[PDB]
């Protein structure tokens, strides 16, 4: 044939740079000095020419004792509260614990070997002061690092240079789910963080350094309800992520369920209905005691139908003995504004309870539960049932039920609810100094974060960066100082909720995350510069 | 030190090594992407919805990404309704991207959400949750069965392939953007207590086009190709199809499709959300188990005469010709007794010939009776139903091909019966399970280009396109795309070779079996290559 | 329309077009899916097929995919094949020419390289009709229908498609195939006749591959990387890889071996292959004769088995272990009974003894007077993965001092036979890790040693594996694009062999996992330079 053609048979072999990798592990210097505990790594070989994948490994000890405990999912990466690469001329890259998760959310192996199994994160129980809650266990959390991105090439290069890899811990509060039976004072004086740090070592013969370009996260969290936050001197960014995130400060922390290990959306649910479940239908020798004097337990009838205002609930429940009676609790927890105002019931949620009452257990095995039971629901703070906005009792559970009520303190909770399913942005609104960038109704800036990234979990982004990662200046959202184009003012406008509806109450905070632009020299010591 | 003294040595010249260690970060084109909705033109030209979107600005310099999203309205009144699974992309019907030159890029829906079928977020998007897909039931005439959503539908492009590099150049022309909507019956699992009529009335499309817009200083645009499908539909029950004007083929899908024209729509059971295999049969089972075993006061009454309702004996053990069930309820009334619908369904051509009976596919049966409900909870159920019989449409087993009554149920499950018309339903049954091509026979003229038994071309598809629902393709194009022409199969128009040619053997069926009188029809889908050239607008040149 | 604050910011220095690429022409090919049918030989008498592939069109291969007919199986008695049949039914792959061996893999190593290709995996035979345990009713009774299985043979030929494709200088290449028996494929129960069917059964295998005709092809040498494994001697925590002179990997890790058994385990989960599903499986069959309800003490149990009636209180005490028992609607006549030792093992006549019935705490259900059985509703346990993978024989071997298996005779005959070849670590999930320490020494000198699995954590993250190995990589260079980084060797200085040094977790002697037998297993991959010079040719980097 006459025509030039390109070989795809082919390829010629390049003789590539000759280094030696090698996995290096490293024990640190623990330091509290809020007493926050604090692992610093230095690094410094003559041969060690370069570095990426950092793996930081943690040894959980045996939880022995009384009382419900568990530790939060994908824990190893829950535990850290900061991340800091530092070298002589100062901090080379730097991450807040809950970016570092945000970046490997999609990283299904490294989240399970941070902590993810039924052995870690279901909620088992202590009997006697010396039986093993929780056996030991090592957890491995994987601090990616733009340095990764391209493995040998993106690598962070030691110009015979004292690396320092200093990571801050969360307490061990927020990495833990206990119940009131658990001695936590007890185990947050004996915990102790025990971390080694891994990475991958290179020895290369004759290096040929050259710059490169570094993407930064940053984050500005506004204050409690407040719609607005701003990032000021935004140069040259690559990325611009929204998202909200709730404070649960004005409450004791305490939830009425966790599912554990099985962390669906209807295991939550689930979990929910089995512990309101035990108090919602009773089967008791004449009125049931053990309630409060707020509590309204109604016998059910023959017909089967209990009729609370418009829902009603069909209750029936098999082999109960004849000295016994069928009981709903009607207002389990309830919230109101005002006494003539819309009733949020939880008991009016469920439409039917089928069931058989065990003789020899004492106790009703529920078969089919047909109800209405959300997400919300499930991650309402059991403070909010009985805050000073409600004007009735709100938990009009037994005490029995209440004591079984866990502390959930996971650090990285994101929306309103467990599983960040409730989108509570109404609208956004992006400015550029003072010029809007970006307005939208629709989430349609996640949905694209999601399509584009490959993500089940994304949020509202907005990227400037669509240049391949490999061999290319990133693009980035050039500034106009003169013209006041140098920050980026964020505002949302959030859902109109129910006032009678608990979830109304849970103290929002929003979050912006910016991706800014970096140049790395290697020039006399390890540098980075911001791109201005 | 930290490094071992055996890798010190191996290292501590000569040759030129490429660097591995550092690279040149290259400047790229000065750009600047933003996320552009838009707001359509809505026409009903029979009566079928087209939304029509105009994209035009000297700024937007390309595109790419396109996302259509569809406001669902409040579903209020009685009866069961629900939406089809991926009910976004079941909704589109035809895609034309289009410019003052003319088409440049059309699709069809369903092959729309055959190339998006893998994508599992895309697909999530348009529709995929126990809210919208589960059948929900309306008890008042003002009674809330679904509450508003909103799904977003992502239109995969070849503009999308590698990027700002495949992206839709705008040569300061007018890209208008055709979307062609399948009607809502189409979109919806339905019963009869629903008022569709009323709905259908009242239901419109509320569409909005999204895409990723780019704003390019100084570009510099290349000519590019691109990949168009085009399918061919074959006649109601023919095993061959043929594809004319192949000149420049990258490659070749062949797959069936079930024709329920003959039938009212009506199927017995549905699993909604829960999609698996598993979930269509326990969903079947469910829906039959009522009226299968009934604990009655003396012979159970509200079934037709042809039904044969038998008392289960002491021993537990009915049998129904050569087929035993084993039934044995717990906690029985003694005024009551355990019965068996010995002809729930049943199917035959000949007054005494071989009969197909969905009741002797079950051989044990266990449960406890519940004094308080007074009904039957069923623990254990050992059955041989499988995917085809959930797949069987209520108008097959009542056809006039049956000597028998057919349908020997209550009439209270008879109305819990629901429509169903998803548009892309593939092969017998609704989860595309059976096989029905024995061989396959590809003809490029007169000459046979390809011939299989096993479905060995879909494990290649399959396999190279990393999917789990695949179709028996045919692949010419081996090349990297974007970065070069992709390599087609050429034709010979003077030898005749400038057609394809698709012959298949269908698995022989059983006459007494339901099945059987399923139409069939064969898809030929052929994806053609086309030369882009933005010279004097944006316009588009078949390979020949 | 484009936003104000855009158009400002934007509206001399060389910038890469990121909107256009130039489209080259590439060489001029046509590619084809090409079947072939192989030449069976059985001379151990092992299955051998051969696939010769000579043709002037066919140019270059890759993408090789093994069929595989599997046949109804009719008679009597519990049958079900293992998960991903197809990968377990090869024993080694061999590609050859003129010039001898180009390309090599051992079964399981092909299987491991393919570990993580879900799509691969589910083509070779993962299916509840082929995997979930069947049983045959008649003696024309079908247990299982025909069906066909596919296995991908990943080569390093698909690496880069078309660029890694084997080129076929006019020569004949040779696909061998050598398969594992039957028996390792299958899990049966005694009552199913094997005997018959292995000598019935016949491999029906056909090799397709994606073929290329090139016009005018432009050869140029390529490197690859080919598996190389060392299985240890029997308990041995050390194995050695010789002649390393140029390799890009080392894996290590364990395998158990089941000679001493007779291959017999009490449970089998079937197709649902997660760890819970493996103990939900071996709780369920234990049940059956755990808890009985009898008129009067249980009978048809060995005169060993200890069957206690559950009193009024519903606590039996084992020892220092509380079984609470409770069953709802038992007839007045009968009463609640515990087998409390249905399995135990003792290598002493009074000391330490490891009891199943002792790992159980709570046990609630209700009697059906229809069925004359009892139904289960909630089971407190401690049951673990180890359990389920005990074989039966350690249960009744000559350490127990007791007599070990208490189990009804009913139960006995349920046992299935589990003779899968890809087995790893010591329980049939390779949940357990029994490598406490690892080194690794090129020559004399220490090359990596670890305490925990550092190697594994690293190999599951750069590869997105959840059934990862402790593997040592040396090439973190692009793949067919650049020359393989390798460990290079100095013979002068003994530097040409990987010794592998494992410190294994001991267990308890009381305890019947002690008796199962490891394998340590070193994978080395070599560096190989690929020299299509008059025939296809493979040469070792040294």
């Known amino acids: 044939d006459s025509i030039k053609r390109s070989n795809v048979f082919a390829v010629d072999s390049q003789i590539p740079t000759l280094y030696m990798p090698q996995y290096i592990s490293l024990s640190g210097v623990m330091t509290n000095d809020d007493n926050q505990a604090i692992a610093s790594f230095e690094i410094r070989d003559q041969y060690i020419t370069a570095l990426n994948h950092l793996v930081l490994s943690l040894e959980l000890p045996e939880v022995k004792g009384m009382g419900r405990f568990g530790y939060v999912p994908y824990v190893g990466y829950k535990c850290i509260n900061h991340v800091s690469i530092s070298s002589c001329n100062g901090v080379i890259w730097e991450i807040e614990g809950e970016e570092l998760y945000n970046n490997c959310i999609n990283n299904t192996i490294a989240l399970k070997h941070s902590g993810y199994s039924s052995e870690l994160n279901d909620i088992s129980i202590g009997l006697t002061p010396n039986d093993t809650i929780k056996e030991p266990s090592t957890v491995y959390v994987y601090i990616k690092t733009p340095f990764d991105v391209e493995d040998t090439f993106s690598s962070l290069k030691l110009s015979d240079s004292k690396i320092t890899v200093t990571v801050t811990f969360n307490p061990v509060s927020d990495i833990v789910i206990r119940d009131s039976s658990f001695d936590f004072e007890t185990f947050n004086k004996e915990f102790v963080y025990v971390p080694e740090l891994s990475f991958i070592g290179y020895m290369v013969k004759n290096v040929q350094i050259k710059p490169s370009f570094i993407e930064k996260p940053r984050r500005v969290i506004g204050q409690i309800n407040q719609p607005t936050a701003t990032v000021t001197e935004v140069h040259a960014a690559t990325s611009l992520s929204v998202y ?49 004097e707020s509590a309204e337990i109604v016998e059910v009838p023959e017909d089967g139908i209990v009729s609370i205002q418009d829902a009603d609930v069909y209750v029936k429940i098999d082999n109960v003995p004849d000295n016994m009676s069928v009981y709903l609790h009607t207002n389990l927890l309830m919230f109101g504004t005002r006494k003539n105002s819309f009733i949020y019931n939880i008991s009016k949620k469920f439409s039917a309870i089928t069931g058989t009452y065990s003789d020899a257990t004492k106790r009703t095995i529920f078969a089919h539960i047909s109800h209405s039971i959300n997400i919300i629901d499930t991650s309402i703070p059991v403070s909010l049932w009985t805050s000073q906005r409600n004007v009735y009792n709100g938990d009009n559970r037994s005490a029995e039920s209440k004591a079984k009520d866990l502390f959930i303190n996971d650090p990285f909770i994101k929306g309103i609810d467990f599983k960040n399913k409730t989108d509570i942005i109404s609208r956004l609104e992006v400015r550029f ?78 979050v912006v995350v910016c991706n800014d632009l970096y140049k790395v020299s290697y020039d006399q010591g390890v540098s980075i510069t911001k791109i201005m």
């Open 433 to 510: 100094g003072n010029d809007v960038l970006y307005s939208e109704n629709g989430p349609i800036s996640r949905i694209y974060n999601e399509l584009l990234t490959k993500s089940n979990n994304g949020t509202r982004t907005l990227t400037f960066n669509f240049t391949p990662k490999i061999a290319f200046r990133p693009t980035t959202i050039t500034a106009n100082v003169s013209r006041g184009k140098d920050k980026l003012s964020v505002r949302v406008v959030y859902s109109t909720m129910d006032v009678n509806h608990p979830i109304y109450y849970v103290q929002k905070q929003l």
């Open 244 to 292: 909200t995130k709730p404070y649960y400060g004005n409450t004791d922390n305490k939830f009425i369920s966790y599912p554990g290990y099985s962390q669906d959306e209807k295991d939550y649910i689930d979990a929910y209905v089995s512990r309101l479940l035990d108090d919602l239908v009773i089967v008791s020798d004449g009125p049931p005691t053990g309630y409060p």
